[PDB]
Amino acid sequence: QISVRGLAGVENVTELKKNFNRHLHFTLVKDRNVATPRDYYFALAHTVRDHLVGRWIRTQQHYYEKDPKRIYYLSLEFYMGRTLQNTMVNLALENACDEATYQLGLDMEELEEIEEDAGLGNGGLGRLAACFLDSMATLGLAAYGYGIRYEFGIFNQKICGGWQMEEADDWLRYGNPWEKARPEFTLPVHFYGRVEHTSQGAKWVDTQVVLAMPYDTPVPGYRNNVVNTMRLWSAKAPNDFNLGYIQAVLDRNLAENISRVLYPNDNFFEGKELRLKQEYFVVAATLQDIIRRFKSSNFDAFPDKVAIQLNDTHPSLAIPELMRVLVDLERLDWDKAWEVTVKTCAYTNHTVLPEALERWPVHLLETLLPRHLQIIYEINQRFLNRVAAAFPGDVDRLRRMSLVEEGAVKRINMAHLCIAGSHAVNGVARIHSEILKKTIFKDFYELEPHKFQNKTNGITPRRWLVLCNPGLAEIIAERIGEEYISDLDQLRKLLSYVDDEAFIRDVAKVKQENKLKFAAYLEREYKVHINPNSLFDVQVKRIHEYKRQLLNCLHVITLYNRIKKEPNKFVVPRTVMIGGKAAPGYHMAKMIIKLITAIGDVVNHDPVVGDRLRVIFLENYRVSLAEKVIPAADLSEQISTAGTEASGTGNMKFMLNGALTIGTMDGANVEMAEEAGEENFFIFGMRVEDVDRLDQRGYNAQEYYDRIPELRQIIEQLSSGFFSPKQPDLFKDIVNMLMHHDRFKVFADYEEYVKCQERVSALYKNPREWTRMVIRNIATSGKFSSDRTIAQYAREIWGVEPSRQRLPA
Ligand SMILES: O=[N+](O)c1ccc(-c2n[nH]c([C@@H]3O[C@H](CO)[C@@H](O)[C@H](O)[C@H]3O)n2)cc1
Ligand SMILES: O=c1[nH]cnc2c1ncn2[C@@H]1O[C@@H](COP(=O)(O)O)[C@@H](O)[C@H]1O
Ligand SMILES: *Cc1c(COP(=O)(O)O)cnc(C)c1O
Numbered sequence: 001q002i003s004v005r006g007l008a009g010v011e012n013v014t015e016l017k018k019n020f021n022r023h024l025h026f027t028l029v030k031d032r033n034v035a036t037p038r039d040y041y042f043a044l045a046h047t048v049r050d051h052l053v054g055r056w057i058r059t060q061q062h063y064y065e066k067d068p069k070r071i072y073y074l075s076l077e078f079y080m081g082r083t084l085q086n087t088m089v090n091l092a093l094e095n096a097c098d099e100a101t102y103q104l105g106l107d108m109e110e111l112e113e114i115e116e117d118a119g120l121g122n123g124g125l126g127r128l129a130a131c132f133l134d135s136m137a138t139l140g141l142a143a144y145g146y147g148i149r150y151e152f153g154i155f156n157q158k159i160c161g162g163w164q165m166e167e168a169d170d171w172l173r174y175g176n177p178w179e180k181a182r183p184e185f186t187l188p189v190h191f192y193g194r195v196e197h198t199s200q201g202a203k204w205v206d207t208q209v210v211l212a213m214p215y216d217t218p219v220p221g222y223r224n225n226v227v228n229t230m231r232l233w234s235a236k237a238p239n240d241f242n243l244g245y246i247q248a249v250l251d252r253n254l255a256e257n258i259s260r261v262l263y264p265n266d267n268f269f270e271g272k273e274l275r276l277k278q279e280y281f282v283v284a285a286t287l288q289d290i291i292r293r294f295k296s297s298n299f300d301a302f303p304d305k306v307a308i309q310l311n312d313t314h315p316s317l318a319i320p321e322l323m324r325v326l327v328d329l330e331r332l333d334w335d336k337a338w339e340v341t342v343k344t345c346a347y348t349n350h351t352v353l354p355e356a357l358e359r360w361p362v363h364l365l366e367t368l369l370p371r372h373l374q375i376i377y378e379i380n381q382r383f384l385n386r387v388a389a390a391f392p393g394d395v396d397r398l399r400r401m402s403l404v405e406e407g408a409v410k411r412i413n414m415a416h417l418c419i420a421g422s423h424a425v426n427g428v429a430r431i432h433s434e435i436l437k438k439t440i441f442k443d444f445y446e447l448e449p450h451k452f453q454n455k456t457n458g459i460t461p462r463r464w465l466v467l468c469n470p471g472l473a474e475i476i477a478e479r480i481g482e483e484y485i486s487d488l489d490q491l492r493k494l495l496s497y498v499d500d501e502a503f504i505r506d507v508a509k510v511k512q513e514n515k516l517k518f519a520a521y522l523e524r525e526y527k528v529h530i531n532p533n534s535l536f537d538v539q540v541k542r543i544h545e546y547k548r549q550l551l552n553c554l555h556v557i558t559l560y561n562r563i564k565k566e567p568n569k570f571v572v573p574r575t576v577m578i579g580g581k582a583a584p585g586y587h588m589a590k591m592i593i594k595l596i597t598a599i600g601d602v603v604n605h606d607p608v609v610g611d612r613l614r615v616i617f618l619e620n621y622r623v624s625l626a627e628k629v630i631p632a633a634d635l636s637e638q639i640s641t642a643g644t645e646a647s648g649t650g651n652m653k654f655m656l657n658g659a660l661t662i663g664t665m666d667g668a669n670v671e672m673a674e675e676a677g678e679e680n681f682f683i684f685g686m687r688v689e690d691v692d693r694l695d696q697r698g699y700n701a702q703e704y705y706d707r708i709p710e711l712r713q714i715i716e717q718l719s720s721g722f723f724s725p726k727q728p729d730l731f732k733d734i735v736n737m738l739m740h741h742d743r744f745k746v747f748a749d750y751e752e753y754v755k756c757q758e759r760v761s762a763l764y765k766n767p768r769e770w771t772r773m774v775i776r777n778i779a780t781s782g783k784f785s786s787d788r789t790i791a792q793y794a795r796e797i798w799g800v801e802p803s804r805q806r807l808p809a
Contacts, residue, residue, distance in 0.1 A: 001095070003474065003477055003478075003482070004470065004473050004474055004482060006092035006093065007092070008095040008096045008098070012096045013096055013099045013100045016047060016093075016096055017104060020047045020100065021043075023047055024039065024040075024043040028042055040106055040111055041111040041112075041114040041115060042177060044097065044108070045083075048091075048093060049177055049178065052091070055220070055226070055807070055809075056218045059227045060229070062807060067305070068800070069306070069799065069800050070143075070144065070293065070306055070307070071136065071141055071309065072146060072286065072290055072307065073143060073144065073146065074147075074308060074310055074311060075125075075126070075146070075311035075314070076147060076148065076279065076311070076315065077120060077129060077147070077311075078118075078120050078121060078133070078145060078147050078230060079123070079126030079127040079130050079154075079623060080117075080120065080130050081463070081623030082112070082116075082118075082623070083115070083217075084111075084112055084115050086462065086467060089222075089462055090221065090223065090462065092223055116174070117153075117171070117623050119171060119262075120148075120150050120153045120232075120262060121153075122262070123541065123542045124266075124648070124649050125266075125311065125312065125350055127623065127649060128311075128428075128457060128786075131460040131464075131649075132145075133145045133219045133228065134219065134221075134462060135458075135785075135787045136219075137221035137222075137224075137228045138221040138224065139794070139802035141228075141790070144228065144231060145231070146230075146232075146233075146282065147231075147282060148234075148259050148278060149234045149259060150259060151172060151234075151260050152168050152260060153169045153171050153262050154264055154622070155168065155169055155264060155584070156620055157619060157620045157621070158619070159593070159597065159619050162593075162597035162598060163593070163594055166584050178218070180215065180217075181213070182214045183213055185214050186211050186212065186236065187211070187212050187288050187289070188209050188210075188238075189210050189212050189281050189285055190207035190209060191209075191210065191277065191368055191369070192206075192367065192368060193205055193206045193207035193370065201327070201331070202327075202371060204324075204370070204371040208255075210236070210237065210238075210255045212236075212285035213233065213235075213236050214231050215232050215233075216229050217231075222485065222486050224804070225806055225807040225808065226807055233259065233281065233285045235255060235256050236255070237252035237255040241255060258281050259278075263275055263278075264581070266583060267355075267356045267546070268355055268356055269357060269359070270585075271358075271359070271361060271364070276360060279317055280369060282315060283315050283321050284321060287318060287325060290306060291325065299330065299336070302340050302344060303340060306344055307344065307798040308322075308345050308346070309346050309793070310346065311350075312348065313349075313357075313358045316414040316415075316417055319341060319345055319379075319417055319420075319421035320376055320417075321372065322337075322340075322341045323338065323375050323379070324371055324372065324375060326341070327375075338382075342421055345421055346425070346797050346798075347418035347419065347421075347422040347426075348425075348455070349425065349426070349427055349436060349441075349646075350646050352435060352436070352440055352643070353644065357413070358414040358415070359411040359412065359413050359414065360414065361409050361411055362404070362409075362410040362412060365412060373412075376403060376412055376417065377404070379403065380402060380420075383401075384398055390447055400443055401416065401443050401444065402416070403416045403420065415440075419444045422451070424451055424453055424797045425441070425453065426454060427455075428647040428668075429457060429646060429648075429667045429668040429671060431688070432454075433453065453796060453797070455792050455793055455796075455797075456668060456671055456783070456784075457648075457649055457668060457784075457786075457789060458649075458652065458790075459652045460785070460786050460787075461485060464630075464653050464656055465656050466485055467627065468628075468657070471513055471514065472507075472631070472657065472658060472778075473485075475503070475506045475507065475510060476494065476778075479493075479494070479497060480493045486787065488781070488782040488784075489782035491778060491781060491782045492779055492780065493779075494775060494778060495779045498772055499772075504768060504771050507774060507775060510658070511632075511774075512532075514631040514632045515632050516532050517632070518536075518628055518631075518632035519532040528616060530575050530614055531611040533573065534574050534575045534612075534614070535572055535573065535635060535760075535764050536575050536632055536635065537574050537577065537635045538577045538629060538632075538633040538634075538636060539552050539578045539580075540577070540579045542581055542583075543581065543582040543590075543592055543593060545588060545744050546744050547639075548639050548641060548744060549578060549580070549596070550592060550734070551746050551753060552578060552637055554714055554746070555754055556615055558710055558754055559571070560599075560602075560603050560606075561710070561714070563608065563609055563613060567608045572765060574612075574761075575616065576614065577616045577617075577629065578617055579617060579618025579619070580621050581620075588733070588737065591731070592734070593617065594730070595731060595734060598724055598730075599723060600614075600617060601723075602723055603615045626650075626653065630657050631657045633659040634660070635661075636651065636655070636661045637662055638650070638651045638661055638664070638669050639663060639685075639753070640667070641686070642664050642666045642690070642691050643666065643691055644666065644744070645669075647667040648668050649668075651669055652668065652672070652781070652784040655777050655778070656778065658777070658778055659774075659777075660680075660681075660760070660763075660773060660774060660777060661777075662682040662756060663681070663683065665685070665687050666688075668784070669681075672781075672784070675781070676777050681777075682759060684755070684756035685749040685752050685753060686748060686749060691745065694748060699742070699748065701740070701747045704747035708751060710754075715735060715738070715739070718731045719731070719732070
């Protein structure tokens with residue numbers, strides 16, 4: 001039907017149908033008479049997978065022969081989502097599969113909905129890793145993603161009586177057709193033990209062994225026949241483990257628990273032993289693989305053939321593990337090993353919130369990884385010797401820069417370790433990289449300014465435009481061709497259509513279709529009833545105080561109170577949608593979810609409001625839900641306190657899909673406004689500098705309560721039980737926090753936020769001008785392609801040249 005989905009040739013369609021029937025019979029062992037939609041999904045997935053295999057084998061063969069520099073992207077999280085559609089898009093098979101399935105009496109869109117998300121991440125960091133893999137393959141880089149195959153990914157969220165409940169995400173129950181187990185490349189990982197010093201150096205002995213078994217998943221590039229590998233490790237006990245008899249076998253679970261479950265803490269550090277085991281497990285297995293591959297061609301050439309990118313500090317143990325292998329096993333002298341390590345490793349920082357920074361207690365490392373602790377101390381002593389030589393007499397600087405933090409509990413600061421041991425350190429948006437140089441890593445920047453870089457984040461336009469919004473992709477392709485899908489800067493050509501009446505109409509029509517489609521999804525799967533002519537005002541992201549879902553709540557109540565005061569005055573109708581998961585132990589985030597649903601309970605059932613205001617909590621926000629709601633959005637809420645959101649990437653997804661943004665000058669919002677023009681963005685609130693000025697005189701929330709009557713009314717409603725008649729004190733923790741210990745200054749941006757929201761509503765009343773502003777946003781979104789981000793990493797950090805060249809088919 002639509003051009004960007006590729007050709008449906010008679011030969012191809014016939015062959016797909018034949019292979020579908022072959023897999024249904026031989027692979028699934030079903031006849032058509034008892035096959036369910038799920039069986040049909042698997043038969044299609046196996047059919048599409050067969051097309052990846054030849055390309056995967058020959059890509060990996062090509063790397064063995066050409067021996068390019070290899071890029072290893074180490075992450076504890078890869079938030080992949082569904083694979084079927086993405087694979088079809090990247091291999092140009094979507095229309096052919098659509099036709100093949102149609103001729104078999106099946107609806108492919110229905111089959112796609114059966115696939116589970118691969119939910120092996122918490123949110124933005126994990127999803128960035130996934131976008132990056134897609135871009136590295138599309139740019140022809142010899143890149144490998146390395147992580148952990150969690151049996152249970154991010155929990156499924158249920159809402160019961162307005163409260164979040166967690167359920168295990170048993171994503172592997174029905175099998176995963178995309179992975180290939182490679183039990184033949186299983187490797188040992190060591191824990192505990194002790195260090196012996198011989199005349200031949202240190203030996204780490206009496207260790208407990210856990211096996212790391214790899215599972216490989218293909219990562220197809222966009223129409224270039226490149227298929228790279230994501231290798232995920234699973235924990236297995238050795239067969240002599242604990243070897244009365246029955247109990248010894250049952251106790252294998254203690255080893256296998258390492259890969260059982262993803263820690264569900266977005267932007268927060270929990271210093272648990274199991275998490276440290278996960279971190280070392282991924283590092284130790286991965287580094288053995290890296291070294292094996294390097295030896296199958298003298299370590300002076302190691303950094304010319306290997307780059308290791310550390311996705312935050314979570315894999316920071318790679319630095320002392322690489323030193324361990326080089327010094328203890330390969331017998332390099334320390335200085336040579338350190339040179340190799342620093343030239344090989346690079347570190348990306350993703351947060352400045354102090355509670356998110358990894359600081360491991362020394363006693364944990366001492367017990368679990370005694371050789372690594374010795375190596376860390378040695379790194380620290382040598383590093384501080386350089387500091388003292390550069391800044392003689394500056395004793396306070398020595399204390400601030402130490403890898404070892406003093407206190408009642410001594411800790412290792414993993415970010416300091418990463419900076420010391422990496423040739424490049426980057427933040428993830430311009431304002432964030434500047435904050436790193438001015439504040440938390442200022443001392444390090446002064447010692448080694450050359451290390452510090454910026455790499456502004458991006459998103460893949462394959463998943464986040466072509467896949468999730470084919471209607472928009474198509475109307476763009478009609479005007480400017482298909483080349484923009486792998487060169488997103490070409491969207492700039494759309495600025496020459498901003499006064500074209502037909503284009504304006506088509507852009508608005510696509511949005512309307514997406515809104516209708518989403519409104520129907522809501523009715524069918526969640527029995528809820530929304531007005532699709534209303535402005536769709538959407539805030540979807542993990543629940544956190546810094547992201548200020550609470551500021552949104554205050555605006556919603558303000559609108560409700562204004563309607564109740566003047567019910568017969570016209571207001572632009574809104575559907576306010578808020579969704580996101582709270583970490584299970586984060587009490588305040590769970591209370592925020594409850595507040596949102598409680599506001600909905602009052603607003604949605606007030607007959608005076610009518611369909612002018614609806615408040616919906618979107619349950620179980622995840623990648624597959626993002627693909628549905630983002631194309632349907634009119635207004636994107638990006639309202640973190642200035643200085644707290646390192647980048648954001650949801651922001652970019654909404655820009656690409658024809659929503660306007662209301663936001664603070666935080667993270668990548670700054671660069672988005674710069675690209676589109678500030679006049680095409682709804683900017684409000686304190687800048688970073690304003691937050692600092694407030695912190696210096698002291699934030700007093702009472703001042704705002706005293707001066708703003710509308711705000712006082714809301715706080716009185718919350719306090720007195722207006723939104724919780726059965727439990728009048730239910731929200732007292734929220735009120736107490738806002739009034740007395742709000743680190744994120746919600747009240748300080750309230751007035752400017754409400755005023756800015758009034759300007760949004762005013763513009764929405766003029767659909768032609770709303771749509772013209774949308775075109776100006778979509779047209780300038782090109783910078784936010786992860787292809788751009790990855791080309792910068794490749795050239796400025798890894799030392800490799802990207803390529804758009806096709807491999808042979
Ligand atoms: O222990 N843990 O399970 C985690 C700890 C920290 C994070 C994290 N830091 N920054 C981001 C996000 O990274 C994203 C990608 O750079 C940014 O866009 C966003 O601003 C930032 O908040 N996540 C995740 C998990
Ligand atoms: O000794 C060899 N002979 C031929 N091909 C090899 C050899 N070793 C590795 N390869 C190729 O590279 C491999 C890719 O897997 P890797 O060993 O995980 O990098 C195989 O799939 C082969 O295509
Ligand atoms: C993009 C995305 C995120 C990140 O959104 P932010 O608004 O940048 O925090 C989180 N979760 C999911 C499922 C995503 O697709």
